[PDB]
Amino acid sequence: AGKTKEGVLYVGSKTKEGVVHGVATVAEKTKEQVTNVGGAVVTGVTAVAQKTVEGAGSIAAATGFVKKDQLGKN
Amino acid sequence: AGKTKEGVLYVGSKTKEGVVHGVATVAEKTKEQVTNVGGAVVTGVTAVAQKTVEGAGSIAAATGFVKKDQLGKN
Amino acid sequence: AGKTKEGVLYVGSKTKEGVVHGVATVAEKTKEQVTNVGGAVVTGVTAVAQKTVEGAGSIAAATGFVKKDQLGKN
Amino acid sequence: AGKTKEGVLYVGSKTKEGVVHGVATVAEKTKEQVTNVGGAVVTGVTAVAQKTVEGAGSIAAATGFVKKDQLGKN
Amino acid sequence: AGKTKEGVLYVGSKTKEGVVHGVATVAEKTKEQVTNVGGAVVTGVTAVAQKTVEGAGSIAAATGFVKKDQLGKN
Amino acid sequence: AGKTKEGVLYVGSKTKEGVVHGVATVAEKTKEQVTNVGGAVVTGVTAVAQKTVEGAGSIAAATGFVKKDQLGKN
Amino acid sequence: AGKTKEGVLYVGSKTKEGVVHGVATVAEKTKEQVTNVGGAVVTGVTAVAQKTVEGAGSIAAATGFVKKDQLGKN
Amino acid sequence: AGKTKEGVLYVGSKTKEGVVHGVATVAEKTKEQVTNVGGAVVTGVTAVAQKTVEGAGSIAAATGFVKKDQLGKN
Amino acid sequence: AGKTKEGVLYVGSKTKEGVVHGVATVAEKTKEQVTNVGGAVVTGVTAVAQKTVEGAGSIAAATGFVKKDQLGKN
Amino acid sequence: AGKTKEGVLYVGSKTKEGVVHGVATVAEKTKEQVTNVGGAVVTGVTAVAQKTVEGAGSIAAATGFVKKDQLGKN
C-alpha cells in the first residue's frame, strides 16, 4: 500500500467534477460562466532526472526560452 | 498494491466529468459556458531521463525555444 | 497489483464523460458551450530515455524549436 | 496483475463518452457545442529510447523544428 | 494478467462513444455540433527504439521539420 | 609556397641517413649495433575525418582493441 | 610561405642522422650501441576530426583498449 | 612567413643528430651506449578536434584504457 | 613572422645533438652512457579541443585509465 | 614578430646538446654517465580546451587514473 518513485519527472493534475450543475439543479438560465477546474499547464519548464552512477560522472545541460506568443494589431 | 517508477517521464491529466449538467437537471437555457476540466497542456518543455550507469559516464544536452505562435493584423 | 516503468516516455490523458447532459436532463436550449474535458496537447517538447549501461558511456542530443503557427492578415 | 515497460515510447489518450446527451435526455434544441473530449495531439515532439548496453556506448541525435502551418490573407 | 513492452514505439488513442445521443434521446433539433472524441493526431514527431547490445555500440540519427501546410489568399 | 590540408589523416615519418658510417670512416670492427632511425609504427589507433556538411548531420563510430601478440612458453 | 591545417590528424617524426659515426671517424671497435633516433611510436591512441557543420549536429564515438602484448614463461 | 592550425591533432618529434661520434672522432672503443635522441612515444592518449558549428550542437565521446603489456615469469 | 593556433592539440619535443662526442674528440673508451636527450613521452593523457560554436552547445566526454604495464616474477 | 595561441594544448620540451663531450675533448675514459637533458614526460594528465561560444553552453568531463606500472618479485 504505497508508491516508490526515483528520478521520475511527470506533469499532470487530478480533478473531479462530481455533480456540477446536477443533482436537483433547475439551472433555468446561466450566463457565460468560465471556471478553471483542474488541468496541467506548463510552458518553458526544464528538468533533469538521473539514476545512480558509479565512478566518475558529469552532467551538462543548457536551455533557453525567449518570447513565445505574439499578438498583432487588432 | 503499489507502483514503481524509475527515470520515467510522462505528461498527462486525470479528470472525471461525473454528472455535469445531469441527474435531475432542467437546464432550460445555457449561455456560452467555457470551463477547463482536466487536460494536459505542455509547450516548450524539455526533460532528461537516464538509468543506472557503471564506470565513467557523461551526459550532454542542449535545447532552445524562441517564439511559437504569431498573430497578424486582424 | 502494481506497475513498473523504467526509462519510459509517454504522453496521454485519462478522462470520463460519464453523464454529461444526461440522466433526467431536459436541456431544452443550449448555447455554444465549449469546455475542455481531458486530452493530451504537447508541442515543442523533447525528452531522453536510456536504460542501464556498463562501462564508459556518453549521451549527446540537441533540439531546436523556433516559431510554429503564423496567422496572416484577416 | 501489473504491467512492465522499458524504453517504451508511446502517445495516446483514454476517454469514455458514456451517456453524453443520453439517458432520458430531451435535448430539444442545441447550438454549436464544441467540447474537447480525450484525444492525443502532439506536434514537434522528439524522444529517445534505448535498452541495456554493455561496454563502451555512445548516443548522438539532433532534431530541428521551425514553423509549421501558415495562414495567408483571408 | 499483465503486459510487457521493450523498445516499443506506437501511437494511438482509445475512446468509447457509448450512448451519445441515444437511450431515450428525443434530440428534436441539433445545430452544428463539433466535438473531439478520442483520436491520434501526431505530426513532426521522431523517436528512436533499440534493444540490448553487447560490446561497442553507437547510435546516430538526424531529423528536420520545417513548415508543413500553407494557405493561399482566400 | 605552402600546403593546405582538411580532414586529412595520414601516418608517416621522415628521416635522413646521410653519412652514417661513411665519409672517411675506418670502422674496422663493429658489434651488434641496433639503432632506431625514423619509421612509422602505429598499432591500435583509430581516427575520424569528415568534411563540411550542411543541415542536420550525425556521426557514429565504435572501435575495440583487446590483446594482440601473445608469446608461448620458450 | 606558410601552411594551413584544419581538422587534420597525423602522426610522424622528423630526424636527421647527418654524420653519425662519419667524417674522420676511426671507430676501430664499437660495442652494442642502441640509441633511439627519431621515429613515430603510437599505440592505443584515438582521435576525432570534423570540419564545419551548419544546423543541428551531433557526434558520438566510443573506443576501448585492454591489454595488448603478453609474454609467456621464458 | 607563418603557420595556421585549427582543430589539428598530431604527434611527432624533431631532432638532429648532426655530428654524433663524428668530425675528428677517434672513438677507439665504445661500450653499450644507449641514449634517447628525439622520438614520439605516446600510448593511451585520446583527443578530440572539431571545427566551427552553427546552431544546436552536441559532442559525446568515451574511451577506456586498462592494462597493456604483461610480462610472464622469466 | 608569427604563428597562429586555435584548438590545436599536439605533443612533441625539439632537440639538437650538435657535436656530441665529436669535434676533436678522442673518446678512447666509453662505458655504458645513457642520457635522455629530447623526446616525447606521454601516457594516459586526455585532451579536448573545440572551435567556435553558435547557439546552444554541449560537450560531454569521459575517459578512464587503470594500470598499464605489469612485470611478473623474474 | 610574435605568436598567438587560443585554446591550444600541447606538451613538449626544447633542449640543445651543443658541444657535449666535444670541442677539444680527450675524454679518455668515462663511466656510466646518466644525465637528463630535455624531454617531455607527462603521465596521468588531463586538460580541456574550448573556443568562443555564443548563447547557452555547458561543458562536462570526467577522468580517472588509478595505478599504472607494477613490478613483481625480483
Side-chain angles (χ1 to χ4, degrees), chain G residues 12-16 38, chain H residues 12-16 37-40, chain I residues 12-16 38-39, chain J residues 13:
Chain G
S13 62
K14 181 178 181 297
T15 189
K16 182 174 181 289
Chain H
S13 62
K14 181 178 181 297
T15 189
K16 183 174 181 289
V37 176
Chain I
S13 62
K14 181 178 181 297
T15 189
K16 183 174 181 289
Chain J
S13 62

PDB file of all heavy atoms in Angstrom, chain G residues 12-16 38, chain H residues 12-16 37-40, chain I residues 12-16 38-39, chain J residues 13:
ATOM      1  N   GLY G  12      53.778  11.452 -36.920  1.00  0.00           N
ATOM      2  CA  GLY G  12      55.063  11.205 -37.561  1.00  0.00           C
ATOM      3  C   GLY G  12      56.200  11.864 -36.795  1.00  0.00           C
ATOM      4  O   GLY G  12      55.971  12.534 -35.795  1.00  0.00           O
ATOM      5  N   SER G  13      57.426  11.679 -37.271  1.00  0.00           N
ATOM      6  CA  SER G  13      58.581  12.276 -36.610  1.00  0.00           C
ATOM      7  C   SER G  13      59.678  12.591 -37.620  1.00  0.00           C
ATOM      8  O   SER G  13      59.943  11.806 -38.531  1.00  0.00           O
ATOM      9  CB  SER G  13      59.123  11.322 -35.545  1.00  0.00           C
ATOM     10  OG  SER G  13      59.545  10.117 -36.169  1.00  0.00           O
ATOM     11  N   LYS G  14      60.319  13.745 -37.450  1.00  0.00           N
ATOM     12  CA  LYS G  14      61.391  14.154 -38.349  1.00  0.00           C
ATOM     13  C   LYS G  14      62.742  14.097 -37.641  1.00  0.00           C
ATOM     14  O   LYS G  14      62.904  14.655 -36.556  1.00  0.00           O
ATOM     15  CB  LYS G  14      61.141  15.574 -38.858  1.00  0.00           C
ATOM     16  CG  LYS G  14      62.259  15.970 -39.825  1.00  0.00           C
ATOM     17  CD  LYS G  14      61.990  17.371 -40.376  1.00  0.00           C
ATOM     18  CE  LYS G  14      63.097  17.751 -41.362  1.00  0.00           C
ATOM     19  NZ  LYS G  14      64.401  17.813 -40.642  1.00  0.00           N
ATOM     20  N   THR G  15      63.712  13.433 -38.258  1.00  0.00           N
ATOM     21  CA  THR G  15      65.041  13.333 -37.661  1.00  0.00           C
ATOM     22  C   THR G  15      66.117  13.247 -38.738  1.00  0.00           C
ATOM     23  O   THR G  15      65.899  12.666 -39.801  1.00  0.00           O
ATOM     24  CB  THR G  15      65.120  12.103 -36.756  1.00  0.00           C
ATOM     25  OG1 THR G  15      66.340  12.132 -36.029  1.00  0.00           O
ATOM     26  CG2 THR G  15      65.064  10.836 -37.611  1.00  0.00           C
ATOM     27  N   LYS G  16      67.280  13.823 -38.459  1.00  0.00           N
ATOM     28  CA  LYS G  16      68.379  13.793 -39.417  1.00  0.00           C
ATOM     29  C   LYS G  16      69.607  13.125 -38.805  1.00  0.00           C
ATOM     30  O   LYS G  16      70.115  13.565 -37.776  1.00  0.00           O
ATOM     31  CB  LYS G  16      68.725  15.219 -39.849  1.00  0.00           C
ATOM     32  CG  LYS G  16      69.835  15.185 -40.900  1.00  0.00           C
ATOM     33  CD  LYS G  16      70.066  16.598 -41.440  1.00  0.00           C
ATOM     34  CE  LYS G  16      71.164  16.570 -42.505  1.00  0.00           C
ATOM     35  NZ  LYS G  16      72.482  16.316 -41.858  1.00  0.00           N
ATOM     36  N   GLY G  38      64.802   9.605 -33.523  1.00  0.00           N
ATOM     37  CA  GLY G  38      63.575   9.883 -34.257  1.00  0.00           C
ATOM     38  C   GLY G  38      62.731   8.622 -34.394  1.00  0.00           C
ATOM     39  O   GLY G  38      63.184   7.521 -34.079  1.00  0.00           O
TER      40      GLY G  38
ATOM     41  N   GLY H  12      54.409  14.151 -32.864  1.00  0.00           N
ATOM     42  CA  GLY H  12      55.693  13.904 -33.505  1.00  0.00           C
ATOM     43  C   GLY H  12      56.831  14.563 -32.740  1.00  0.00           C
ATOM     44  O   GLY H  12      56.601  15.233 -31.740  1.00  0.00           O
ATOM     45  N   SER H  13      58.057  14.378 -33.216  1.00  0.00           N
ATOM     46  CA  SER H  13      59.212  14.975 -32.555  1.00  0.00           C
ATOM     47  C   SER H  13      60.309  15.290 -33.565  1.00  0.00           C
ATOM     48  O   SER H  13      60.574  14.505 -34.475  1.00  0.00           O
ATOM     49  CB  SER H  13      59.754  14.021 -31.490  1.00  0.00           C
ATOM     50  OG  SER H  13      60.176  12.816 -32.113  1.00  0.00           O
ATOM     51  N   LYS H  14      60.949  16.443 -33.395  1.00  0.00           N
ATOM     52  CA  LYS H  14      62.022  16.853 -34.295  1.00  0.00           C
ATOM     53  C   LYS H  14      63.373  16.796 -33.586  1.00  0.00           C
ATOM     54  O   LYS H  14      63.535  17.354 -32.501  1.00  0.00           O
ATOM     55  CB  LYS H  14      61.772  18.273 -34.803  1.00  0.00           C
ATOM     56  CG  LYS H  14      62.890  18.669 -35.769  1.00  0.00           C
ATOM     57  CD  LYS H  14      62.621  20.070 -36.321  1.00  0.00           C
ATOM     58  CE  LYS H  14      63.728  20.450 -37.307  1.00  0.00           C
ATOM     59  NZ  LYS H  14      65.031  20.512 -36.587  1.00  0.00           N
ATOM     60  N   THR H  15      64.343  16.132 -34.203  1.00  0.00           N
ATOM     61  CA  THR H  15      65.671  16.032 -33.607  1.00  0.00           C
ATOM     62  C   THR H  15      66.748  15.946 -34.683  1.00  0.00           C
ATOM     63  O   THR H  15      66.530  15.365 -35.746  1.00  0.00           O
ATOM     64  CB  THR H  15      65.751  14.802 -32.701  1.00  0.00           C
ATOM     65  OG1 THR H  15      66.971  14.831 -31.974  1.00  0.00           O
ATOM     66  CG2 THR H  15      65.695  13.535 -33.556  1.00  0.00           C
ATOM     67  N   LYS H  16      67.911  16.522 -34.403  1.00  0.00           N
ATOM     68  CA  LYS H  16      69.010  16.492 -35.362  1.00  0.00           C
ATOM     69  C   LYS H  16      70.237  15.824 -34.750  1.00  0.00           C
ATOM     70  O   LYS H  16      70.746  16.264 -33.721  1.00  0.00           O
ATOM     71  CB  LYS H  16      69.356  17.918 -35.794  1.00  0.00           C
ATOM     72  CG  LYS H  16      70.466  17.883 -36.846  1.00  0.00           C
ATOM     73  CD  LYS H  16      70.697  19.297 -37.385  1.00  0.00           C
ATOM     74  CE  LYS H  16      71.795  19.269 -38.451  1.00  0.00           C
ATOM     75  NZ  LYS H  16      73.113  19.015 -37.803  1.00  0.00           N
ATOM     76  N   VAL H  37      67.450   9.957 -28.266  1.00  0.00           N
ATOM     77  CA  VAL H  37      67.539  11.186 -29.045  1.00  0.00           C
ATOM     78  C   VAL H  37      66.290  11.383 -29.894  1.00  0.00           C
ATOM     79  O   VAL H  37      66.108  10.720 -30.914  1.00  0.00           O
ATOM     80  CB  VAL H  37      68.773  11.139 -29.948  1.00  0.00           C
ATOM     81  CG1 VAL H  37      68.808  12.386 -30.833  1.00  0.00           C
ATOM     82  CG2 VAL H  37      70.031  11.094 -29.078  1.00  0.00           C
ATOM     83  N   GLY H  38      65.433  12.304 -29.467  1.00  0.00           N
ATOM     84  CA  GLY H  38      64.205  12.582 -30.202  1.00  0.00           C
ATOM     85  C   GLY H  38      63.362  11.321 -30.339  1.00  0.00           C
ATOM     86  O   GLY H  38      63.815  10.220 -30.024  1.00  0.00           O
ATOM     87  N   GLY H  39      62.135  11.490 -30.812  1.00  0.00           N
ATOM     88  CA  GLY H  39      61.235  10.358 -30.990  1.00  0.00           C
ATOM     89  C   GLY H  39      59.866  10.673 -30.407  1.00  0.00           C
ATOM     90  O   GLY H  39      59.749  11.451 -29.461  1.00  0.00           O
ATOM     91  N   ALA H  40      58.834  10.059 -30.970  1.00  0.00           N
ATOM     92  CA  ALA H  40      57.483  10.284 -30.481  1.00  0.00           C
ATOM     93  C   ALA H  40      56.916   8.995 -29.900  1.00  0.00           C
ATOM     94  O   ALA H  40      56.681   8.027 -30.620  1.00  0.00           O
ATOM     95  CB  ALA H  40      56.590  10.769 -31.625  1.00  0.00           C
TER      96      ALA H  40
ATOM     97  N   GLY I  12      55.040  16.850 -28.810  1.00  0.00           N
ATOM     98  CA  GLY I  12      56.324  16.603 -29.450  1.00  0.00           C
ATOM     99  C   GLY I  12      57.462  17.262 -28.685  1.00  0.00           C
ATOM    100  O   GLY I  12      57.232  17.932 -27.685  1.00  0.00           O
ATOM    101  N   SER I  13      58.688  17.076 -29.161  1.00  0.00           N
ATOM    102  CA  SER I  13      59.842  17.674 -28.500  1.00  0.00           C
ATOM    103  C   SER I  13      60.940  17.989 -29.510  1.00  0.00           C
ATOM    104  O   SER I  13      61.205  17.204 -30.420  1.00  0.00           O
ATOM    105  CB  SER I  13      60.385  16.720 -27.435  1.00  0.00           C
ATOM    106  OG  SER I  13      60.807  15.515 -28.058  1.00  0.00           O
ATOM    107  N   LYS I  14      61.580  19.142 -29.340  1.00  0.00           N
ATOM    108  CA  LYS I  14      62.653  19.552 -30.240  1.00  0.00           C
ATOM    109  C   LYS I  14      64.004  19.495 -29.530  1.00  0.00           C
ATOM    110  O   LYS I  14      64.166  20.053 -28.447  1.00  0.00           O
ATOM    111  CB  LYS I  14      62.403  20.972 -30.748  1.00  0.00           C
ATOM    112  CG  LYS I  14      63.521  21.367 -31.715  1.00  0.00           C
ATOM    113  CD  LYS I  14      63.252  22.769 -32.266  1.00  0.00           C
ATOM    114  CE  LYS I  14      64.359  23.149 -33.251  1.00  0.00           C
ATOM    115  NZ  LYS I  14      65.662  23.210 -32.532  1.00  0.00           N
ATOM    116  N   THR I  15      64.974  18.831 -30.148  1.00  0.00           N
ATOM    117  CA  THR I  15      66.302  18.731 -29.551  1.00  0.00           C
ATOM    118  C   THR I  15      67.379  18.644 -30.629  1.00  0.00           C
ATOM    119  O   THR I  15      67.161  18.064 -31.690  1.00  0.00           O
ATOM    120  CB  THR I  15      66.382  17.500 -28.647  1.00  0.00           C
ATOM    121  OG1 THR I  15      67.602  17.530 -27.919  1.00  0.00           O
ATOM    122  CG2 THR I  15      66.326  16.234 -29.501  1.00  0.00           C
ATOM    123  N   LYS I  16      68.542  19.221 -30.348  1.00  0.00           N
ATOM    124  CA  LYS I  16      69.641  19.191 -31.307  1.00  0.00           C
ATOM    125  C   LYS I  16      70.868  18.523 -30.695  1.00  0.00           C
ATOM    126  O   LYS I  16      71.377  18.963 -29.666  1.00  0.00           O
ATOM    127  CB  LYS I  16      69.987  20.617 -31.738  1.00  0.00           C
ATOM    128  CG  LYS I  16      71.097  20.582 -32.790  1.00  0.00           C
ATOM    129  CD  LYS I  16      71.328  21.996 -33.330  1.00  0.00           C
ATOM    130  CE  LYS I  16      72.426  21.968 -34.395  1.00  0.00           C
ATOM    131  NZ  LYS I  16      73.744  21.714 -33.747  1.00  0.00           N
ATOM    132  N   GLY I  38      66.064  15.003 -25.412  1.00  0.00           N
ATOM    133  CA  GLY I  38      64.836  15.281 -26.146  1.00  0.00           C
ATOM    134  C   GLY I  38      63.993  14.020 -26.283  1.00  0.00           C
ATOM    135  O   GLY I  38      64.446  12.919 -25.969  1.00  0.00           O
ATOM    136  N   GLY I  39      62.766  14.189 -26.757  1.00  0.00           N
ATOM    137  CA  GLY I  39      61.866  13.057 -26.934  1.00  0.00           C
ATOM    138  C   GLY I  39      60.497  13.372 -26.352  1.00  0.00           C
ATOM    139  O   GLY I  39      60.380  14.150 -25.405  1.00  0.00           O
TER     140      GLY I  39
ATOM    141  N   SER J  13      59.319  19.775 -25.106  1.00  0.00           N
ATOM    142  CA  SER J  13      60.473  20.373 -24.444  1.00  0.00           C
ATOM    143  C   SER J  13      61.571  20.688 -25.455  1.00  0.00           C
ATOM    144  O   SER J  13      61.836  19.903 -26.365  1.00  0.00           O
ATOM    145  CB  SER J  13      61.015  19.419 -23.380  1.00  0.00           C
ATOM    146  OG  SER J  13      61.438  18.214 -24.003  1.00  0.00           O
TER     147      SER J  13
END
